[PDB]
Amino acid sequence: ADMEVIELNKCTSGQSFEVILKPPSFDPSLEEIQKKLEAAEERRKYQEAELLKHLAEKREHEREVIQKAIEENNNFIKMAKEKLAQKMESNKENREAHLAAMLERLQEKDKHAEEVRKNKELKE
Amino acid sequence: REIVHIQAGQCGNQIGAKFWEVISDEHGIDPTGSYHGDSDLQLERINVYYNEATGNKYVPRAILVDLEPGTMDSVRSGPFGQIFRPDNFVFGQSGAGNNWAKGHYTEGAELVDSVLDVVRKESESCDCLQGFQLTHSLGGGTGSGMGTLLISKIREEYPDRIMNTFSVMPSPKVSDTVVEPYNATLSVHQLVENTDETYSIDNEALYDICFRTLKLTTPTYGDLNHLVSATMSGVTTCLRFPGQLNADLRKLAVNMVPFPRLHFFMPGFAPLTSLTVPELTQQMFDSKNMMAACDPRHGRYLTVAAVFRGRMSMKEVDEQMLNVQNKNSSYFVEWIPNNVKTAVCDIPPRGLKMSATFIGNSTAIQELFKRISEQFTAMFRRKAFLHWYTGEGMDEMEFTEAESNMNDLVSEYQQYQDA
Amino acid sequence: REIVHIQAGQCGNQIGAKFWEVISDEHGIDPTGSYHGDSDLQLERINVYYNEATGNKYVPRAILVDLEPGTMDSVRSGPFGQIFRPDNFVFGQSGAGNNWAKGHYTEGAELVDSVLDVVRKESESCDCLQGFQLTHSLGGGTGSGMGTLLISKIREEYPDRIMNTFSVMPSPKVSDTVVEPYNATLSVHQLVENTDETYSIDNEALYDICFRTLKLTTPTYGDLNHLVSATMSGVTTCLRFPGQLNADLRKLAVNMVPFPRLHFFMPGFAPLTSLTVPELTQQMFDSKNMMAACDPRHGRYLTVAAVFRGRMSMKEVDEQMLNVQNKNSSYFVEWIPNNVKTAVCDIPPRGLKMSATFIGNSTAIQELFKRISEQFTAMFRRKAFLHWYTGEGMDEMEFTEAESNMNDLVSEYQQYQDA
Amino acid sequence: RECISIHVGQAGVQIGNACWELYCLEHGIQPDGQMPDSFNTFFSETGAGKHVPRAVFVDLEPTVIDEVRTGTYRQLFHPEQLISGKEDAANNYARGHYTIGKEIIDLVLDRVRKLADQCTGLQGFLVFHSFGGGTGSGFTSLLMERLSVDYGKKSKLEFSIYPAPQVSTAVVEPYNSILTTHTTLEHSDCAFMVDNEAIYDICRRNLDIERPTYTNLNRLMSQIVSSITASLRFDGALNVDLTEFQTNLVPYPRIHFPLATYAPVISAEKAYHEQLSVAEITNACFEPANQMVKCDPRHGKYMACCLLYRGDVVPKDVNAAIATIKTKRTIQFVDWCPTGFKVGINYQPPTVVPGGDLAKVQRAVCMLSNTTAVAEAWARLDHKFDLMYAKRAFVHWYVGEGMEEGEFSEAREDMAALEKDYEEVGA
Amino acid sequence: RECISIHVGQAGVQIGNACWELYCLEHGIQPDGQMPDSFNTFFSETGAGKHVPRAVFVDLEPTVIDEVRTGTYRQLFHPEQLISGKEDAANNYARGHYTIGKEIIDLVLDRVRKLADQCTGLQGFLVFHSFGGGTGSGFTSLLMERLSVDYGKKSKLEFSIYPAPQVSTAVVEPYNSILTTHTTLEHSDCAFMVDNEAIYDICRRNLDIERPTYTNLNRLMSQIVSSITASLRFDGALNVDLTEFQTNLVPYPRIHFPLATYAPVISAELSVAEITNACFEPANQMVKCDPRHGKYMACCLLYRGDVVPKDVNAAIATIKTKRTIQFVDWCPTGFKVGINYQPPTVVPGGDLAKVQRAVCMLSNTTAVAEAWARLDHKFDLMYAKRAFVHWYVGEGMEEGEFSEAREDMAALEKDYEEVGA
């Protein structure tokens, strides 16, 4: 269904029309932010200028712990060269005027042995 | 869109030699020569793993790194030994140590540059490089040590790009060496920070897999090495072939990891050794079948991905997958909506007219990590062989930073069993 | 590595003539000539006692010192009289005295130089000279007097090198004087200061050995001299033969003398006169068998050494020795751990297919020294004959210095019977 | 009177690609662009011989756009109108709208400017894009922001592919959808959603194609898209110009989302059966089964209806069809509205792709409806979002590229608002 | 990857002398040095024809070194690599480290410098020396001091003959041992003790040789030494590498002292498992002691010959479950197992027979400080009366050097006990 048809536009190669069937019943854009397009760009150059000089960090700790090693082997060398210079000398000194400590036995029982054949020269 | 590949040391190198011996096969490349394959597809994505060269010829994108000639001269001879650019070889000449410090710091740094210098020329000479993937032992020295570093060095010279690793997390069974716990604990801290996805290949799982189910009595470093090799195959695949998705691998990463904490995937395979499809799923989703020694049970899944291979209709694949998650409802997370994705590819592998491979981001992996953080404090306890690294120029508490970090990780895995 | 040898005076000389007549035999040397022996070893260490000469010929390393022609012309004629280099003879021409002063001071010094000048040429013409050994009477004059000096003179011209003496400590039973006590006491002080090891050969013991066991009626200076001779043999031996130890003789010294006070060894022999091995030990370790008149009993051992001769197995030797110390536990010191060492050599002596000789550093020797420091103060309780030396140009109290030193020594021997 | 298509990102592209293929067949243009009504709506009679689409194509990874300048039609487009961007957006809106969008946006915008520079009174834009997915959500959204500046009035019509579990999505998807929608919304005038799932369900059922290709689905959408734009390529009353769309589909400026049912979809090899009655096609328009966004209006209320018939048809019947739905189905209009039905008849018979899976028909209807139950579809998207976001799910992956924790907030904000407006137009 | 042997003093020398003998037979080099894997670890292919060991020999008295350039192998070595010092050290450490060492130390050090000068990346030293005994304690100690200077990193492995009552010692012995140990210690990376007594005990029992020669004992040690170094001589893809065998053997920087059990010793004229099972054997140890008493911290089996891991692991399994296990408090329970396909070649004249396979068990056990005490107790009670002390104070030593060494000894004796639980 029971129709009534409004006519709107008969045309070369088509038609249109409404078919109202039952009454109804009762009752900017902003160019602005390509600036926030620049906000992201911003907080990623930071995001990364983090992990960067944070990884430039995680190196030259590296370069540090390499050296805190060679730098700790040199400690073991010019610590224990003198465990040897003050031993192979606390030694050749401990003896070299200490075996000659054995010669004050000799130039003694010698300057006495001569000294009492000087007693025999005591029959003149 | 393009990816260069790093292999580092004894395990890292042998793993890859049998990785390239498979993909080179499926594409069809002689030891040196270019193509020979009655298929056609292949060469779509051959791009992604092959910077090609003189004549027709194909040379893989491969950086070979080790700190002792040894295992590298073991590849130049043998498999597709001829294939890699002989200038893509970096020998170490000195010791490895089997000690993480030598690898990451002293005997390591020493080389780094001359591999850094090569990844550069290869990557800086791709055309829209997508990322790096690298293989390595996770305990032990050169691989684990120099690796962790190399990737820590790669980041920075590449922020931007994504980091992919296959890591063989080492076990008490199959190789002793009072130390790995240390090397591993140290590296695990290290991965967690530098990479975007890592694949935990547990040797414990690997050899328990050749035994509890396979009856291979005295397992080679070979077979077992052959297992990873074929798991490497199917984990890539859509990376290297298809016409389905297209897989930025970043597209992977950004989809399989809800939490920045590069979560470590446990892999696993279809028909094992050296096939109905139902029977190919209940195998792939079975715990006796995972490349990481965990029973995904005590531990639910976050995200899962599975890629199937060969002549079979995605009719039963659709509904066999969209099945598993009902005859096991509460073992995939409630709050990540469509977190198990499947992909179909129809060009077969080694033998096999049918094969699934599986990638799971599961908190079951907490189990794998806890146990190494425990061989750890069972030594770092009474400050054990620590002296091998105190002496190398490392600090006492730089172990406590990585036990105190690895424990943090185990804790997130735990926390996430939520509302 | 090389050792020159001194003989001085009546006893010192005859002792050596019968020392050289035995070692020359065991090596196999004619009166003059070189070798004649169906053995082969010998010439390994012949070096050590034989500076060799023109043709093949062997001439002993021998310095011969005496202060009267007498006993020296007694050797040129007789035994292996020819053997010694005729320029190695130093005659004295005047009296000996039988008085220690003449020997160490007046008629002695007189000669010293022309023997000091010879030990030089022979030592300074060895090639890695090791030490000197000298023989002598300990009472009596030339031997004891000039000796003490010669060694007091050798030290100094050689600090360094070690000093070895056989000393015949003289007795009331069988002696040609009343004075010896003086000469000996004066010399014993003198040894204690200058030498590194001395062998106390008590004549009391020697003749008591030809009597209490041997029934040898009227003993010549011949036999009894023959005993020392063969005891000299086995005391060296490892010095002059083997393939066991090697014996620096300083190696000896530094091992047999805990205390700087050149402790004097008492010797002793195996089969006596002119053999099961058990019966060879309990003989060697029996007091009736020691060349020094002491009963090692009142007096424990510090260190002991025994060298065995002839083909017999070190099976029973090992355990016979490591026996004696159990059937006699408390008579070897508690605090010097392995203080009895044995050496095996398998080339026989005079007759004898079996022979042990024994060297003991025992405080039993205190007994031997006390008794002479008692003949002494039984005479220096009198300025008795003192006037023979007062007159020679010596002081009264230079006797008291050596009584007062000989008593000090007897006191250490005593003190050491400790915790 | 001049009309520019923009297709952005994988979906956008492929959907387009294969429906300019149908426009050409319809207007009888050979692939090389030559041919032996007016349809100038969509092509420029450039130089002598050739025809060129009034289109741009933008993807951030070659591949898709690439195989366009690969597969015959190679010729159709001018070198410059396909833009392609080296690096993928990786399935995330952050990248599209901000990080990688920024790069190519200024070039794109210049090339659309170019096709318009040469239009004496351009009237609009037909933006074609995916709902989830990297560049489809992001670039679009960036695009539509900018276009709203350079071309204030000029209508923007979006065709959107609302995604579904089984024509493959991806976890993060729901984020992206919710995300763009919010931005895009206050910029886009009218928007035809297309449930992938609905489409896929039509094939599985009506065509027997067991596991459908993209290309399989895409054809269907091709048909539907034509059957909309049809109006403004041939000229003959109703949606003659783009303005006429608002007038007829949106009562309420909140960009509303019309639902397209489509006439007979019947697999060739059926071709030669008895063609169906004017009435029967109509009667399948009022059909859950035949919808194009999974939902239903025995549940929701209408506020704008509109039938688009193609072929030889006569009003007299179109009517006595409409007649026995009024007394055969669920009438169902909103408290304060007529019970509309602007009917569009176009005499031109429905042409279809020879290779294809569907058969030549005789007449086909097209029912565009604005119904409130389309917010069934807004909820199923929201719920996903809400419960993922309930644990920051993947959020970081965006916070990374430069986004705000609170952009995610202040979009789902908007989403809950619309979800009410829709329910808030119910009596 | 290049590896220098130093043998010092009677023992050092004789031990070595008769295990380069074994190396040669193993690598099939004829005495004159000529011959018709890599083994370059230990030889330099010098000139065309000859091979020359990578070794120095130092004694302070000829004799021993002398009968080297006397007895075929006359040829092996270059004239200059055997150093010899005219005057003995007389069994006392003062001499070796100070008095007579001083003299020859500087020449020695130059000649090792010469064999390393010719090595593109030398990696270490195998120092061979006696525990007691003049030049063995003393010169070694001096050597190792200096070497630590000239070659900081480069490993020093010492092989030590801990001495015993009946393969003859000498009173003062104990002093010398305690003495060098202390100095040597903070310079030496890892040290393999060899109880002479143990060795001697193996012969008397397993070989029947009633009263064994030096050369008798020495063969045994030769075998044991080989089976260690075996590793870095040739290859065999299955293991090898001492480098990182040590890794386990020394947990704790105090130079630790591994204990060498050896496989089958059976007189000329057995299952994979059986040989193993005699490694866990008091009877078959190589320092008199026992680990039913002490605790393990590092274990390590060195198989030689035709062996299969199949066989090796199933013998390892049931070693953990019917025997005394013994792994301390805080270790993996390890077992670094190394197989070297190359079969165990033995000396033709010698007393042992050709085998087929031979194990070698290296263990770091706490009960090895049983051996540190038996040495200390001797020292303590001698010194308790200055014993012989003077003989050293003479050559130039200090009353307090003797103190400040026994000091150290009592500390280590505790560390070992202090890795208790």
Ligand SMILES: CC[C@@H](C)[C@@H]([C@H](CC(=O)N1CCC[C@H]1[C@H](OC)[C@H](C)C(=O)NCCc1ccccc1)OC)N(C)C(=O)[C@@H](NC(=O)[C@H](C(C)C)N(C)C)C(C)C
């Ligand atoms: C855990 C290692 C394991 C896989 C093998 C062994 C080692 C090996 O590498 N092999 C076997 C022969 C050659 C080689 C491989 O065969 C295919 C192959 C050549 C390879 O891929 N090699 C790696 C490259 C390399 C070459 C040269 C030097 C170094 C490395 O593989 C069989 N092996 C000896 C063991 O497992 C051994 N393990 C054990 O004894 C136990 C374990 C298992 C409980 N210890 C840890 C105590 C044995 C006894 C079972």
Ligand SMILES: Nc1nc2c(ncn2[C@@H]2O[C@H](COP(=O)(O)OP(=O)(O)OP(=O)(O)O)[C@@H](O)[C@H]2O)c(=O)[nH]1
């Ligand atoms: N109907 C249909 N849906 C598609 C098509 N391609 C992608 N989609 C859907 O749109 C979503 C993915 O969006 P895409 O356009 O692929 O992503 P993009 O970033 O826009 O494109 P890429 O840069 O290539 O990643 C998923 O829900 C898919 O189901 C297509 O060709 N046809």
Ligand SMILES: Nc1nc2c(ncn2[C@@H]2O[C@H](COP(=O)(O)OP(=O)(O)OP(=O)(O)O)[C@@H](O)[C@H]2O)c(=O)[nH]1
């Ligand atoms: N196993 C073994 N032990 C020996 C050998 N030679 C000596 N010894 C032991 O080592 C200690 C003696 O050390 P030596 O090497 O002889 O003394 P040295 O100073 O180094 O050498 P010399 O200068 O000849 O005295 C004693 O414990 C002996 O048991 C040997 O050839 N084999």
Ligand SMILES: COc1cc2c(c(OC)c1OC)-c1ccc(OC)c(=O)cc1[C@@H](NC(C)=O)CC2
């Ligand atoms: C090698 O290339 C792959 C790349 C990706 C995925 C994947 O797993 C099937 C791959 O294979 C290993 C992938 C993953 C995971 C998801 O999480 C469940 C997802 O939603 C979605 C996907 C993939 N997308 C689709 C539509 O299936 C995109 C990323």
Ligand SMILES: COc1cc2c(c(OC)c1OC)-c1ccc(OC)c(=O)cc1[C@@H](NC(C)=O)CC2
């Ligand atoms: C002639 O050469 C000799 C040289 C020495 C010793 C010895 O007595 C058996 C000699 O024979 C007389 C010697 C001595 C004594 C010891 O004190 C018990 C010792 O331990 C050790 C020894 C000898 N060494 C050994 C290992 O028996 C070395 C010094």
Ligand SMILES: Nc1nc2c(ncn2[C@@H]2O[C@H](COP(=O)(O)OP(=O)(O)O)[C@@H](O)[C@H]2O)c(=O)[nH]1
């Ligand atoms: N599955 C696998 N694991 C290996 C292989 N080689 C070593 N590993 C494991 O990784 C650890 C040591 O790795 P390694 O490669 O020697 O370290 P590298 O010296 O850095 O190359 C061992 O404990 C093994 O568990 C390999 O062939 N395959």
Ligand SMILES: Nc1nc2c(ncn2[C@@H]2O[C@H](COP(=O)(O)OP(=O)(O)O)[C@@H](O)[C@H]2O)c(=O)[nH]1
């Ligand atoms: N056993 C031994 N003792 C002797 C010999 N000649 C002398 N004596 C002892 O030494 C003391 C005197 O020695 P003598 O050689 O005459 O002194 P000299 O004048 O210096 O040579 C005597 O009391 C004897 O006890 C000797 O031929 N053999």
Ligand SMILES: [Mg+2]
């Ligand atoms: Mg995208």
Ligand SMILES: [Mg+2]
């Ligand atoms: Mg010595």
